[PDB]
Symmetry: D3
Subunit: 291 residues, 6 copies
């Protein structure tokens, strides 16, 4: 039966996540709580967004995503709960997840609940939504919420009510689209025949380097598997390799691989060695690619 | 059905916790195991105590708390199993947890099982207890326990029998109050109009600063929300701010907030910035407060 | 209910493990997923092996072990799925796990599923096996597997089918013994009457030192409890103590203990203090022992 | 005998400084070379300036100051050689250096030779000058200067000729005042009645904190010895103490002292303990002071 | 002609030492200033003492030792100036320094000038003294000394007057023996046949380990070259080697050597490898030796 | 008059270098001791060689180079003293050092004294020699040398006698060429049109990267200033730039410069930024260059 997938900035160094889970099991006795991750940089909504955007196609229909970083905790702000539209295919190629031909997911089958602070920006961009509500009903949140713990009060608790079958439309008033806070997503720019983006993430624990340059950005340049690329990082450290599906395509252990990661984005790595860690490469460094 | 909430010093870098879990599912097939945390400083009973004392009000009645750091592993020592009295309200204000008016918890509704080494000191202080037993019966522990793994043998295994409905009074003989080991809890001193305590913890991953000065100590001084405080850390850092419910009350990002944390304790932080990390503030540093 | 115990190198800093879990619940709705650990050094098959070899006796019969580090992801390689023979006793002494006299486990009661890259080397050595198959059927893996995520495609997904009762023999063709990749396990040598091995691991979070010198290597050498030992580490740092069952046997806090760990191997520690961390002792350092 | 006092960014990890010295003795055999320091942050002209501005009153008349960080090495740029006017009193109080009443120094008694890159900015501001020349004559520099070693070619070599009595006016053409490159010296601001500046330096090896708030800024603001001050660092860390002449005035070891350093600037310290190091205080952090 | 050997806690990261030197050349134009070292832990008089006690036999007669760490700077304290008695033999064996049979040094041939804070404790112990004066005359120190720079005002400046031939007896009044401040030197204990001391120092940059167990303590036990020793560090590291004159006597590179250092003290090292650095051995650790 | 340039592995954290200097002034009262450097990695003869090979052309004729790392201290080995032949031009271009056309140095004008352990390998290679002697005479070394301090006994002391005019041929017997120990100098290899060497050094404090690829190696490939080069480091981090005389030729601050350093070797840097430090580039990394 019901699943809550829980992504927070609470860490795993104290009992904070367990407090939320205790309440989730209290409210929805049959629930399964799946940890997404609790290690994001606090208050970094763009990073939290990366951990939650790709999730729906992996989960059983009816799954509730409880997703929180809440620096405006204790203020008059209230969470947003949305039923997304498209589960959405994903991966380097763009497909359903699972055995055989994959598991097709029906539309309108997932709910996200989150602070209304832009955390859901890319979820809404990539999946769309069918309905959105402000979370205000004392049936689903505390009458006297703990000031410093709104992720528990305004996300974990109401997520468990939704998992327990509390009607989404009863959590509070519908929100107009402009009332849902979004963050600005920096565009990949074309610079002659080059594409210019950033390092979006270091892929821990491996030290692979992920960029914000999407497959679609490459397809738009006619760059496909086999293309010899020059990928320049930090505007000083350059790299040369063909675009390949995987790490082993580089040949010898330690050789440079340029590939599409499992999220659909242009990435660079060493084959069975860490690229990022020895050279201290970091998120936010410039990333330029050209054939 | 049954829940075991599991707090240990085992970490999550090998299969130790999984070994305990396997045995829990072996003994109580329908159990749900909830991780509290496994990252405590080993052998620091005062720190372990902080991760378990606030738990009961969050959990369904009948939950068993399996809580362990066991430096006396492999000796003639035996664990203690206690049925607590008051589930106890908590928070900055002192309330039940949950939506609406919160979930009131019945008395005598939770069991803790732990080494008899002081780990349960504050649990017993804040909740009281109705009965306490030494854990000795070969029905609930190994006849030949692994010398170096008493958290598994003397806590995890018998917790699962308890969760499965093994009668608490049958784990072994009743313990008199003086036979339950306690650690000394240093008091918050009165020093004129001031209060003198310590930094109890750095609140990871945020770098908030928690003190052992409780709301009840503040009340003794008549310090309420709105009072302008000087909070001096480490003897030399006279921070000045009013006592506010939350971080955002400090105004601009990075401004100092003095507040009551979600555990009921006087704390200090910066608004959506880390206080402790840039200046390497630490547990054990002195903390003085005055109006 | 069915259990999957999941060991990977995916870490816990993003949604990787949760994607695997989502698919596990999709395929086998009544499953319980137990995390073994996700923190292993990527691509270190010998380390991964250490985290999985001791598991079976702790788990209910029918448990599926999904175990992966997959540096050959996206290649023509296919996973191996084996039903092990002996659940196998373990510990410092060699016993069944659990309360009373322990829980005996029937033969042929556990499946491991893993990359065919040597990860299962010690599992097969210590437990033996009844049957082994290559994992190829589109009924249990994707027809179009994600190139960079074979742990999910070729381990997590099929493990969930096996947990749901998919016949093991139907995953693909039987593998001959020589077709199952092994790593070389470096032997404990004798230099005269000294036993010469290595530091196999630092036991986090404690800083205990584990060697690859097993109880049986000691028995062959005529060393039992009470024997005064000289244990030399890194060909530099000497330590002297009798062989004892546990840490507290050393007397005062900080005193050296030489002992058999819970996995059955010669180890060294300080009593309730860290040995490894102050001296920066490491996995791979030489370890020599003599009576 | 002639003295060259030598300040560079060359460090002391190779033979760089010794190459300069060899040439100094070659050109001026009776010279004494005094190391000022060689550890400055490379290319940080403001830091280099701090190490040289206070020197003249300490040295015998006729001393040549050879002072260099040379990031424009190998370009068409040429060094500037100046004879300063006032030797200038210094210290917390403003006095001549030395025993008795100190050693008065005659005007026009010192030469500085440096890259024309702003290094001499504060030297000229605090001392003034009588004459300034561009260093171009092949009598005092190489006809074929080493491209990457202009500190040696254009500072060390000519300084040795000047020490040996080569007429200053013969090194090259006179420079007009506007032709001498200056850096902007960021002013101490007033925010109401608070003086607002920066941490100018960490005083190694002690971990004292130096600000750019000078004795005269204090005098203008009506602050003298005995005044109770609140000094805030990094817009976060507050400290409170009276202004005192020295560290021991703070009382117990570890107590906060706010003082005028030996260069005449407002500074903060712990009495015989490091302030900066435990709190990781740094150059460039804001510093605010108020009575 | 005259030599001042200068040891301070001033470091070499700014112009502090250069300021002292300028004043030395100002007062005594023909002086040679020799840096002893400037890198001592500030305020650690025992460490400063180790850098100056072995000096006299290496220097020409008439050398002045200017030696300073001055945490009491700016108080009513005044330096002490002493003419030592015995230049004293030194080394592992106890000999004069130099070629041939060494350079015998006359008695009463060296002056030390230092804060009266215990810095000269071991100088006076090992050399004795013939006369001692408080440094007060405005002929040799500033009438208005810089409060925060007493090493310059009360040591460097008067050292230069002394080097210039200013009569020692004229610096101020004679001091009685009890007026010369000393630090306590912990003894090397006899413990059965064993000797119990400490690690006095890590010998940088090699990472050799020096003890406070002197050749004369070894002689008391009849421990000579060739004796097989157990040297235990930090309480738990029973190193075993014969006492040898030098490192290479240990044989293979990396082997343990136990030796008498160039200062006369029992020490331990590896042959052409670092002992202290890999295992983070430290000053203050216990050191026990027995045959 | 006489100069001794002193290069050792003694560091500057204690009085070791000062002990040697004391003796140098004792033996040769008129001497000037110039520090080359004391910070080399102990026992690394190849590194020590780099700090001393380029020195002669900078120093007055008659200069004695006292150069030591002595891991065979206390053994029967004895130092070598050589009169070199060619002073040798140097730099990126190959010229005399100094003002005007530079200072031409006569042949046979410099002596090196060093352990006979290969330290002088490159000195002898680049300068040649006219005579070489084993240093054994009790007129120039101690009759009873300190076992652990042969750099003082067998280098510093006899260097001072040579500076004082002791006849070189009287220090001991002449050495045949094969009796002078040399280290192996790895060749730069041609790999098609590429040159393959190593990173010889990180140029501290700047973080420039120096290779063992000489100007002559470039001239041999017809690579001159202006040539577009691809310089690959560590076999993964590549770089592209024209060969230029200096850093500023790169344009903007932070741009990659490929140049000939002041020692004559192909090097790579960022313009007024550190290359090595952010990417943790190190000595011993591969360096490949191609036009
Ligand atoms: C050794 S740990 C068990 C997990 C370990 N990774 C293993 O596989 O054996 C078990 C218990 O021993 C205690 N322990 C661990 N190291 C210890 C030490 N050096 N001294 C005393 N107790 C220790 C811990 O607090 C814990 O309660
Ligand atoms: C304080 S944390 C609650 C867990 C905490 N360990 C506890 O036991 O109370 C709750 C929320 O506060 C936010 N938060 C934490 N520290 C903050 C700070 N200094 N400023 C703004 N928000 C903060 C976090 O993002 C999180 O969403
Ligand atoms: C890339 S990780 C998948 C999780 C990743 N964070 C993601 O979202 O795509 C999948 C498998 O690839 C392997 N892997 C990761 N980096 C690798 C590299 N640089 N070379 C070879 N294999 C690698 C890992 O061992 C793991 O089994
Ligand atoms: C290269 S350093 C000379 C010493 C060096 N160790 C050598 O032997 O060649 C000479 C001058 O170049 C400057 N310099 C060094 N690295 C630089 C860089 N990457 N960009 C600009 N200037 C630099 C320094 O400031 C210094 O003044
Ligand atoms: C401040 S240092 C002088 C050099 C400093 N860089 C300057 O320019 O003023 C002078 C003396 O003060 C002492 N000193 C430095 N910091 C101190 C502190 N925080 N407390 C007590 N003494 C200190 C040192 O031991 C030294 O003897
Ligand atoms: C011991 S150091 C002398 C300085 C030392 N700080 C002292 O006061 O005695 C003298 C010589 O010993 C060599 N040395 C130092 N430690 C060594 C070791 N562990 N093995 C071999 N040689 C060593 C060094 O290279 C140096 O040339
Ligand atoms: Cl929260
Ligand atoms: Cl345990
Ligand atoms: Cl994977
Ligand atoms: Cl330079
Ligand atoms: Cl001083
Ligand atoms: Cl030496």
């Amino acid at each position: 039966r019901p699943i809550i997938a829980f992504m927070s900035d609470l860490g795993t160094t104290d009992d904070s996540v367990a407090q939320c889970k205790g309440l989730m099991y209290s409210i929805c006795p049959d629930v399964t709580v799946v940890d997404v991750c609790h290690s994001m940089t606090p208050w970094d909504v763009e990073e939290g967004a990366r951990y939650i955007v790709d999730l729906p196609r992996f989960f059983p229909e009816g799954t509730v995503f409880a997703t929180t970083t809440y620096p405006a905790t204790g203020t008059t702000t209230r969470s947003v709960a949305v039923r997304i539209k498209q589960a959405a295919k994903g991966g380097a190629r763009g497909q359903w997840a699972g055995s055989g031909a994959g598991f097709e997911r029906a539309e309108g089958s997932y709910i996200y609940i989150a602070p209304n602070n832009g955390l859901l920006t890319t979820v809404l961009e990539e999946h769309g939504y069918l309905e959105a509500y402000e979370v205000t009903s004392p049936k689903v949140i505390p009458e006297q919420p703990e000031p410093t713990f709104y992720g528990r009060e305004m996300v974990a608790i109401p997520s468990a009510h939704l998992a327990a079958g509390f009607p989404l439309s009863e959590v509070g008033r519908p929100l107009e689209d402009h009332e849902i806070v979004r963050f600005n997503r920096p565009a990949v720019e074309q610079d002659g025949e080059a594409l210019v983006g950033v390092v979006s993430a270091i892929d821990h624990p491996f030290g692979n380097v992920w960029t914000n340059i999407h497959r679609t950005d490459l397809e738009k340049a006619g760059i496909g598997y086999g293309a010899r690329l020059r990928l320049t990082l930090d505007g000083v450290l350059p790299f040369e390799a063909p675009l390949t599906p995987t790490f082993a395509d580089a040949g010898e252990i330690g050789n440079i691989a340029i590939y599409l990661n499992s999220r659909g984005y242009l990435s660079i790595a060493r084959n069975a060695a860490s690229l990022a860690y020895p050279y201290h490469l970091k998120e936010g460094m410039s990333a330029r690619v050209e054939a």
